[PDB]
């Protein structure tokens, strides 16, 4: 079995906790405490490999300490999540990407762009906008719904595949 340290980042309210819990428990949790940062394991077979996915669901205040940088640096791959109904969350993606590159001291960190809440009608960030951003970074884009589970396995499993490709460079 191989362990993978996955970190879920993005603005408050994009569905980081709901995506994490959907992966771990196969159910949609409404209004999970917005302040709580925590880690969960999922054991899963991906392309024949038994994987131990340790998933950090980030929360809390915007703060930069040396300890906070050290903790983020333990991530092997990052899900950069926005919500398709929240333009400001999409505009925050650049920041999260740059902070990941800063703490990892690398231009090439495993990352997937996730557009969550795809079950909602009130879409303000179009598929093309997200695809173009992801193309500019050289990373995959996956649309997800933590409500319906659409795309959830794809998002996490694609991230694992991106880590495996990085390990081979
Ligand atoms: C809508 O408002 C919010 O979402 C407020 C909450 C929020 N905004 C931001 C933020 N924003 C809002 C913008 N402001 C300028 C207004 C930038 N950057 C953050 C950032 F760069 C780091 C950060 C610090 C660090 O040392 C190293 C890192 C390495 C990789 C990735 C991130 C970090 C961290 C800590 C680690 C993580 N993730 C938090 C940031 C943040 N937060 C909090 C909530 C929502 N996202 C996190 C949980
Ligand atoms: N319709 C819908 N609601 C979602 C989805 N993901 C999260 N939510 C809701 O959006 C709010 C914020 O989700 P949460 O998981 O707390 O976001 P976090 O702050 O990024 O951890 C909650 O009310 C969730 O129930 C989704 O894919 N679809
Ligand atoms: Mg949360």
PDB file of C-alpha atoms in Angstrom, residues 4-163:
ATOM      1  CA  UNK A   4      -0.587   9.996  -0.338  1.00  0.00           C
ATOM      2  CA  UNK A   5      -0.866  13.375   1.506  1.00  0.00           C
ATOM      3  CA  UNK A   6      -3.656  15.326  -0.313  1.00  0.00           C
ATOM      4  CA  UNK A   7      -4.585  18.868   0.683  1.00  0.00           C
ATOM      5  CA  UNK A   8      -7.890  20.560  -0.243  1.00  0.00           C
ATOM      6  CA  UNK A   9      -7.582  24.365  -0.584  1.00  0.00           C
ATOM      7  CA  UNK A  10      -9.895  27.163  -1.633  1.00  0.00           C
ATOM      8  CA  UNK A  11     -12.021  29.995  -0.336  1.00  0.00           C
ATOM      9  CA  UNK A  12     -14.483  29.571   2.506  1.00  0.00           C
ATOM     10  CA  UNK A  13     -17.788  28.083   1.324  1.00  0.00           C
ATOM     11  CA  UNK A  14     -16.627  26.411  -1.912  1.00  0.00           C
ATOM     12  CA  UNK A  15     -17.396  22.887  -0.551  1.00  0.00           C
ATOM     13  CA  UNK A  16     -14.033  21.590   0.685  1.00  0.00           C
ATOM     14  CA  UNK A  17     -15.586  19.883   3.713  1.00  0.00           C
ATOM     15  CA  UNK A  18     -18.576  18.576   1.709  1.00  0.00           C
ATOM     16  CA  UNK A  19     -16.234  17.086  -0.966  1.00  0.00           C
ATOM     17  CA  UNK A  20     -14.007  15.506   1.700  1.00  0.00           C
ATOM     18  CA  UNK A  21     -16.939  13.978   3.590  1.00  0.00           C
ATOM     19  CA  UNK A  22     -18.527  12.746   0.314  1.00  0.00           C
ATOM     20  CA  UNK A  23     -15.279  10.890  -0.460  1.00  0.00           C
ATOM     21  CA  UNK A  24     -14.904   9.453   3.075  1.00  0.00           C
ATOM     22  CA  UNK A  25     -18.639   8.690   3.949  1.00  0.00           C
ATOM     23  CA  UNK A  26     -20.656   8.593   0.643  1.00  0.00           C
ATOM     24  CA  UNK A  27     -23.072  11.275   1.872  1.00  0.00           C
ATOM     25  CA  UNK A  28     -23.660  14.980   1.557  1.00  0.00           C
ATOM     26  CA  UNK A  29     -23.181  16.943   4.820  1.00  0.00           C
ATOM     27  CA  UNK A  30     -24.892  20.387   4.830  1.00  0.00           C
ATOM     28  CA  UNK A  31     -23.334  23.271   6.919  1.00  0.00           C
ATOM     29  CA  UNK A  32     -20.248  21.301   8.368  1.00  0.00           C
ATOM     30  CA  UNK A  33     -18.631  23.734  10.851  1.00  0.00           C
ATOM     31  CA  UNK A  34     -16.840  26.290   8.568  1.00  0.00           C
ATOM     32  CA  UNK A  35     -13.979  26.851  11.096  1.00  0.00           C
ATOM     33  CA  UNK A  36     -12.878  23.210  11.556  1.00  0.00           C
ATOM     34  CA  UNK A  37      -9.653  22.015   9.867  1.00  0.00           C
ATOM     35  CA  UNK A  38      -9.153  18.245  10.001  1.00  0.00           C
ATOM     36  CA  UNK A  39      -7.635  15.212   8.245  1.00  0.00           C
ATOM     37  CA  UNK A  40      -9.354  11.955   7.141  1.00  0.00           C
ATOM     38  CA  UNK A  41      -8.096   8.725   5.565  1.00  0.00           C
ATOM     39  CA  UNK A  42      -9.743   6.873   2.651  1.00  0.00           C
ATOM     40  CA  UNK A  43      -8.331   3.456   1.615  1.00  0.00           C
ATOM     41  CA  UNK A  44      -9.058   2.969  -2.112  1.00  0.00           C
ATOM     42  CA  UNK A  45      -7.721   0.985  -5.044  1.00  0.00           C
ATOM     43  CA  UNK A  46      -6.809   3.292  -7.998  1.00  0.00           C
ATOM     44  CA  UNK A  47      -5.596   1.654 -11.256  1.00  0.00           C
ATOM     45  CA  UNK A  48      -4.845  -1.569  -9.295  1.00  0.00           C
ATOM     46  CA  UNK A  49      -2.710   0.177  -6.543  1.00  0.00           C
ATOM     47  CA  UNK A  50      -4.006   0.137  -2.922  1.00  0.00           C
ATOM     48  CA  UNK A  51      -3.831   3.817  -1.841  1.00  0.00           C
ATOM     49  CA  UNK A  52      -4.055   5.324   1.671  1.00  0.00           C
ATOM     50  CA  UNK A  53      -5.317   8.857   0.951  1.00  0.00           C
ATOM     51  CA  UNK A  54      -4.733  11.243   3.883  1.00  0.00           C
ATOM     52  CA  UNK A  55      -6.892  14.248   3.065  1.00  0.00           C
ATOM     53  CA  UNK A  56      -6.377  17.625   4.799  1.00  0.00           C
ATOM     54  CA  UNK A  57      -9.589  19.713   4.708  1.00  0.00           C
ATOM     55  CA  UNK A  58      -8.293  23.282   5.290  1.00  0.00           C
ATOM     56  CA  UNK A  59     -10.212  25.926   7.288  1.00  0.00           C
ATOM     57  CA  UNK A  60      -9.801  29.012   9.433  1.00  0.00           C
ATOM     58  CA  UNK A  61      -8.139  32.432   9.138  1.00  0.00           C
ATOM     59  CA  UNK A  62      -5.764  33.674   6.465  1.00  0.00           C
ATOM     60  CA  UNK A  63      -2.415  33.620   8.355  1.00  0.00           C
ATOM     61  CA  UNK A  64       1.192  32.951   7.268  1.00  0.00           C
ATOM     62  CA  UNK A  65       3.566  31.613   9.888  1.00  0.00           C
ATOM     63  CA  UNK A  66       6.654  29.463   9.409  1.00  0.00           C
ATOM     64  CA  UNK A  67       4.697  26.595  11.140  1.00  0.00           C
ATOM     65  CA  UNK A  68       1.768  27.122   8.713  1.00  0.00           C
ATOM     66  CA  UNK A  69       4.126  27.014   5.690  1.00  0.00           C
ATOM     67  CA  UNK A  70       5.823  23.839   7.067  1.00  0.00           C
ATOM     68  CA  UNK A  71       2.401  22.171   7.478  1.00  0.00           C
ATOM     69  CA  UNK A  72       1.241  23.059   3.928  1.00  0.00           C
ATOM     70  CA  UNK A  73       4.615  21.861   2.596  1.00  0.00           C
ATOM     71  CA  UNK A  74       3.777  18.291   3.791  1.00  0.00           C
ATOM     72  CA  UNK A  75       1.082  18.115   1.015  1.00  0.00           C
ATOM     73  CA  UNK A  76       2.107  15.941  -1.978  1.00  0.00           C
ATOM     74  CA  UNK A  77      -0.808  17.131  -4.116  1.00  0.00           C
ATOM     75  CA  UNK A  78      -3.430  19.867  -3.902  1.00  0.00           C
ATOM     76  CA  UNK A  79      -7.084  20.095  -4.946  1.00  0.00           C
ATOM     77  CA  UNK A  80      -7.622  23.824  -5.735  1.00  0.00           C
ATOM     78  CA  UNK A  81     -11.369  24.234  -5.309  1.00  0.00           C
ATOM     79  CA  UNK A  82     -13.654  27.069  -6.427  1.00  0.00           C
ATOM     80  CA  UNK A  83     -17.442  27.148  -6.631  1.00  0.00           C
ATOM     81  CA  UNK A  84     -19.025  27.599 -10.084  1.00  0.00           C
ATOM     82  CA  UNK A  85     -21.528  30.128  -8.583  1.00  0.00           C
ATOM     83  CA  UNK A  86     -18.787  32.273  -6.892  1.00  0.00           C
ATOM     84  CA  UNK A  87     -16.525  34.376  -9.190  1.00  0.00           C
ATOM     85  CA  UNK A  88     -14.432  35.609  -6.209  1.00  0.00           C
ATOM     86  CA  UNK A  89     -13.599  31.970  -5.301  1.00  0.00           C
ATOM     87  CA  UNK A  90     -12.383  31.412  -8.901  1.00  0.00           C
ATOM     88  CA  UNK A  91     -10.265  34.619  -8.753  1.00  0.00           C
ATOM     89  CA  UNK A  92      -8.626  33.285  -5.515  1.00  0.00           C
ATOM     90  CA  UNK A  93      -7.228  30.199  -7.331  1.00  0.00           C
ATOM     91  CA  UNK A  94      -4.119  32.074  -8.546  1.00  0.00           C
ATOM     92  CA  UNK A  95      -3.217  32.935  -4.941  1.00  0.00           C
ATOM     93  CA  UNK A  96      -3.524  29.337  -3.709  1.00  0.00           C
ATOM     94  CA  UNK A  97      -1.414  28.076  -6.648  1.00  0.00           C
ATOM     95  CA  UNK A  98       1.302  30.639  -5.929  1.00  0.00           C
ATOM     96  CA  UNK A  99       1.368  29.894  -2.204  1.00  0.00           C
ATOM     97  CA  UNK A 100       1.666  26.163  -2.978  1.00  0.00           C
ATOM     98  CA  UNK A 101       4.601  26.886  -5.336  1.00  0.00           C
ATOM     99  CA  UNK A 102       6.173  29.123  -2.640  1.00  0.00           C
ATOM    100  CA  UNK A 103       6.089  26.595   0.254  1.00  0.00           C
ATOM    101  CA  UNK A 104       7.029  23.592  -1.968  1.00  0.00           C
ATOM    102  CA  UNK A 105       9.939  25.590  -3.549  1.00  0.00           C
ATOM    103  CA  UNK A 106       8.878  24.175  -6.946  1.00  0.00           C
ATOM    104  CA  UNK A 107       7.273  25.294 -10.233  1.00  0.00           C
ATOM    105  CA  UNK A 108       5.810  21.748 -10.716  1.00  0.00           C
ATOM    106  CA  UNK A 109       3.586  20.673  -7.801  1.00  0.00           C
ATOM    107  CA  UNK A 110       0.759  18.076  -8.401  1.00  0.00           C
ATOM    108  CA  UNK A 111      -2.524  20.019  -8.532  1.00  0.00           C
ATOM    109  CA  UNK A 112      -6.055  19.658  -9.909  1.00  0.00           C
ATOM    110  CA  UNK A 113      -8.482  22.565 -10.476  1.00  0.00           C
ATOM    111  CA  UNK A 114     -11.945  21.663  -9.094  1.00  0.00           C
ATOM    112  CA  UNK A 115     -15.129  23.587 -10.010  1.00  0.00           C
ATOM    113  CA  UNK A 116     -17.589  22.493  -7.287  1.00  0.00           C
ATOM    114  CA  UNK A 117     -21.392  22.954  -6.919  1.00  0.00           C
ATOM    115  CA  UNK A 118     -22.027  21.895 -10.571  1.00  0.00           C
ATOM    116  CA  UNK A 119     -25.542  20.712  -9.536  1.00  0.00           C
ATOM    117  CA  UNK A 120     -26.615  24.384  -9.050  1.00  0.00           C
ATOM    118  CA  UNK A 121     -28.333  26.395 -11.861  1.00  0.00           C
ATOM    119  CA  UNK A 122     -26.873  29.848 -10.907  1.00  0.00           C
ATOM    120  CA  UNK A 123     -23.525  29.353 -12.725  1.00  0.00           C
ATOM    121  CA  UNK A 124     -21.247  32.500 -12.977  1.00  0.00           C
ATOM    122  CA  UNK A 125     -17.917  30.768 -13.931  1.00  0.00           C
ATOM    123  CA  UNK A 126     -18.212  29.032 -17.350  1.00  0.00           C
ATOM    124  CA  UNK A 127     -16.548  25.678 -18.220  1.00  0.00           C
ATOM    125  CA  UNK A 128     -14.328  27.471 -20.843  1.00  0.00           C
ATOM    126  CA  UNK A 129     -12.986  30.022 -18.259  1.00  0.00           C
ATOM    127  CA  UNK A 130     -11.988  27.151 -15.936  1.00  0.00           C
ATOM    128  CA  UNK A 131     -10.543  24.998 -18.737  1.00  0.00           C
ATOM    129  CA  UNK A 132      -8.459  27.976 -19.975  1.00  0.00           C
ATOM    130  CA  UNK A 133      -7.104  28.653 -16.442  1.00  0.00           C
ATOM    131  CA  UNK A 134      -6.192  24.971 -15.952  1.00  0.00           C
ATOM    132  CA  UNK A 135      -4.523  24.890 -19.440  1.00  0.00           C
ATOM    133  CA  UNK A 136      -2.457  27.983 -18.426  1.00  0.00           C
ATOM    134  CA  UNK A 137      -1.217  26.061 -15.332  1.00  0.00           C
ATOM    135  CA  UNK A 138      -0.714  22.706 -17.148  1.00  0.00           C
ATOM    136  CA  UNK A 139      -3.138  20.937 -14.750  1.00  0.00           C
ATOM    137  CA  UNK A 140      -6.430  18.977 -15.036  1.00  0.00           C
ATOM    138  CA  UNK A 141      -9.863  20.597 -14.538  1.00  0.00           C
ATOM    139  CA  UNK A 142     -12.721  18.518 -13.011  1.00  0.00           C
ATOM    140  CA  UNK A 143     -16.268  19.736 -12.363  1.00  0.00           C
ATOM    141  CA  UNK A 144     -17.794  18.306  -9.168  1.00  0.00           C
ATOM    142  CA  UNK A 145     -20.876  18.204  -6.999  1.00  0.00           C
ATOM    143  CA  UNK A 146     -20.422  17.251  -3.341  1.00  0.00           C
ATOM    144  CA  UNK A 147     -24.257  17.039  -3.251  1.00  0.00           C
ATOM    145  CA  UNK A 148     -24.697  14.395  -5.989  1.00  0.00           C
ATOM    146  CA  UNK A 149     -21.130  12.944  -5.933  1.00  0.00           C
ATOM    147  CA  UNK A 150     -20.695  13.919  -9.655  1.00  0.00           C
ATOM    148  CA  UNK A 151     -16.939  14.023 -10.388  1.00  0.00           C
ATOM    149  CA  UNK A 152     -15.796  13.457  -6.766  1.00  0.00           C
ATOM    150  CA  UNK A 153     -13.905  10.207  -7.361  1.00  0.00           C
ATOM    151  CA  UNK A 154     -12.521  11.647 -10.620  1.00  0.00           C
ATOM    152  CA  UNK A 155     -11.147  14.735  -8.806  1.00  0.00           C
ATOM    153  CA  UNK A 156      -9.292  12.803  -6.079  1.00  0.00           C
ATOM    154  CA  UNK A 157      -8.163   9.921  -8.324  1.00  0.00           C
ATOM    155  CA  UNK A 158      -6.876  12.360 -10.990  1.00  0.00           C
ATOM    156  CA  UNK A 159      -4.837  14.069  -8.253  1.00  0.00           C
ATOM    157  CA  UNK A 160      -3.308  10.717  -7.284  1.00  0.00           C
ATOM    158  CA  UNK A 161      -2.427  10.120 -10.958  1.00  0.00           C
ATOM    159  CA  UNK A 162      -0.781  13.570 -11.095  1.00  0.00           C
ATOM    160  CA  UNK A 163       1.341  12.672  -8.033  1.00  0.00           C
TER     161      UNK A 163
END
